[PDB]
Amino acid sequence: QDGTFDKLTKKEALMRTRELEKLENSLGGIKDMGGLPDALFVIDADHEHIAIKEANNLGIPVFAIVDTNSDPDGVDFVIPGNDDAIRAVTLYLGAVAATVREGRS
Amino acid sequence: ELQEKLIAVNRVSKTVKGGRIFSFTALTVVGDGNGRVGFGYGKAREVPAAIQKAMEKARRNMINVALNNGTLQHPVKGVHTGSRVFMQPASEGTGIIAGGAMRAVLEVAGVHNVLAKAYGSTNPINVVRATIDGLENMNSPEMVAAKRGKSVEEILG
Amino acid sequence: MNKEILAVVEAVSNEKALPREKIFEALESALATATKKKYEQEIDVRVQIDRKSGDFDTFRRWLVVDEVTQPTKEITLEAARYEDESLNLGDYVEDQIESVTFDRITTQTAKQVIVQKVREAERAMVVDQFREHEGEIITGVVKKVNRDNISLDLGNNAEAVILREDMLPRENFRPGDRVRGVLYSVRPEARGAQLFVTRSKPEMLIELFRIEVPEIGEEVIEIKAAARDPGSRAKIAVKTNDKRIDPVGACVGMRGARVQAVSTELGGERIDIVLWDDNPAQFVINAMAPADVASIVVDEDKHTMDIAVEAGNLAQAIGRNGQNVRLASQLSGWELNVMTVDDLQAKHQAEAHAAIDTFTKYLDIDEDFATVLVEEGFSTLEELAYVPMKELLEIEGLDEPTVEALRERAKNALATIAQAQEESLGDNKPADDLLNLEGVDRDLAFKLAARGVCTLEDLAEQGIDDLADIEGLTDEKAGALIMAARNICWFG
Amino acid sequence: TPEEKLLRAIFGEKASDVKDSSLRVPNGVSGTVIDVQVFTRDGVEKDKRA
Amino acid sequence: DPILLRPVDDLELTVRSANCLKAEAIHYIGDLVQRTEVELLKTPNLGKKSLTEIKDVLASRGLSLGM
Known part of the structure; x- marks a missing residue:
């Protein structure tokens, strides 16, 4: 973001900014956190089934928007509802954002 | 405090084109003496690292x-x-x-x-x-x- | 000669990682100052060093200003523009002046200014790169021991200071000893010691645990609070989000090895490690360790907690000179009152009797009905006056008319408390004798009388500290009123 | 010393080990300088006071 | 006199009197001895009782206010 983006090798400087942006999305908003989370709000139980199995290895209460094809056993606070329509996801994301704003008093 | 306890080491093997490679597995157990107990398996290519990796998962496995x-x-x-x-x-x-x-x-x-x-x-x-x-x-x-x-x-x- | 300037600029730029421009600006200022000292008159001087040859021209600078206060160093914009129309306010007019010969005098001045520029560039960038160290446990060598402070050498011409209050009470350092401490403040005393290092504050304990406990450095375990009596005893409160990790066990380590390493670095300070709880009562029970707590009563309004202990545990709960209760109170943020189970029951019986007497006296109710109000949790006339009508209607035997009458009596009792004080010395004597004190409105007189300051003599006896909590009274206004009261009472 | 090159740091020349020293005169008499003569062997650069 | 160079805390004053003197930047016994009784009575949180304590303690060391 400032400094060695030119200093030694221009092609290899394009390697690092090719390294950067793939790491930018995979490790997105996790770098601001540090340490383990306290809860975990999932929007699809079936698709992200690794994390629910991963979070239940530790002591993390999770929050899954579940569709009818998945299995609601590892999730603690199960939420039934559609999750493949875009307008459906903005309900749950808009609710979980505005409520946690009220919770950060 | 944690009162760790080793049970049995073992010499397991597996083969490749060069020959066969051994390692060691060592089942251990830990327990507080008042209702908490946990075991852990662990395996490595050397018995000091085998028993230590055994305990390290036995700490989290307590019931x-x-x-x-x-x-x-x-x-x-x-x-x-x-x-x-x-x-x-x-x-x-x-x-x-x-x-x-x-x-x-x-x-x-x-x-x-x-x-x-x-x-x-x-x-x-x-x-x-x-x-x-x-x-x-x-x-x-x-x-x-x-x-x-x-x-x-x-x-x- | 010429190529030697370039070789010096390149050597210094590479060795001190400093912009060549900043070194030249400083050499120009150094040479200007050395030139000014050769003239008997106070002149203004600009020096310009050529960046390719190392040759330098010296001027009689004339700071272009709007109004000339110093005719020897300043020129008006109108006069400057007569020589060069391109000049603006803040520019310099020059005058062909003989450049000072670079003798060992100018050489020494140039060396001093370069060293000072390196302190504000190389050393400043080193401190910026060591952002962790500015906050973590820096290591220094004791250069000098005085009565009131210890000077540490950190290397690279950086000096730090440990103040007497920042030392442990039993530490004796000698010149040449290595000392660790937290860099808790960076000020601007470049010449001398700008760095302030502590071994006594709680941050030293937190950072020692961060280094000794990997799980704290990895943010798996968090230190929520630390309370410390330096060189004697400390308490730390630890939390983890990972249910697989015991945070107390991790900080203690195998057979206490980790906590003993921290204790040894702190001169044998005893460290208690407690589990942080989000419930204040459970957290205080944990903080009181090693004393067993029998019951806790929480007063949320006073921000206080009464802690009952068995009579055998009382001495352990208080600790030597109250050290255990004080460290628990500092760790929780609550005021902690440690008593026996029998003393807590006697206190509650005395408070219940005082509440019954207050309600019987002011509400014109019988002792049986006053007892029911105290058993339902009412202790003050304010609670009865202001609590939601629904809570008073949940009490067995209260109807809506009786609750309204009880609230009206409680409000009238509260009013009469202030009204009697006013009639005696509030809107009467405090609004006359104590009103004489410069700046004493009727509202302030009633606020003073609510603290028991009813007369102009009572106000003359106060300190500024006794009045500091009165809303609308600044320390200056309090001091003025106390002095006005003293002038009338003691010097009238 | 390496500091004998401090001169070089602002100027140059060779080394500073050479004893820099200005021929200063002794005491015992006051006075008022009334007349100064300067004689120059021919070829030598006349300075500004000559 | 080496007594003037001592801090005011060495006078064994009440915690109130010592904190009132520190609030007025009086650090040494030599600073205290120069102040008059009328000046000390203007200081914040300085009562007639604390002034009598300061006089009795200064008198025990052979010092007086206003030197």
């Missing part, structure tokens, strides 16, 4: 068991994959009279009086898994009272 005064609650079975451990509480049985790999897991759990004997293939890692599920389903009268009858007294007199 709570509810007992009375150094002995069990009731008789309880223990079946797991060719290892039928029997456990009888034996109120002041004057020592833990059990076989190998049960004498470890019962001691660090904190009991001192149980009579026990393993029926079947006396294999060490499969028999310490046999006592654990046999101990974690064994229930105190408190849990029995608060699901059934709803008096702590009359359920055992």
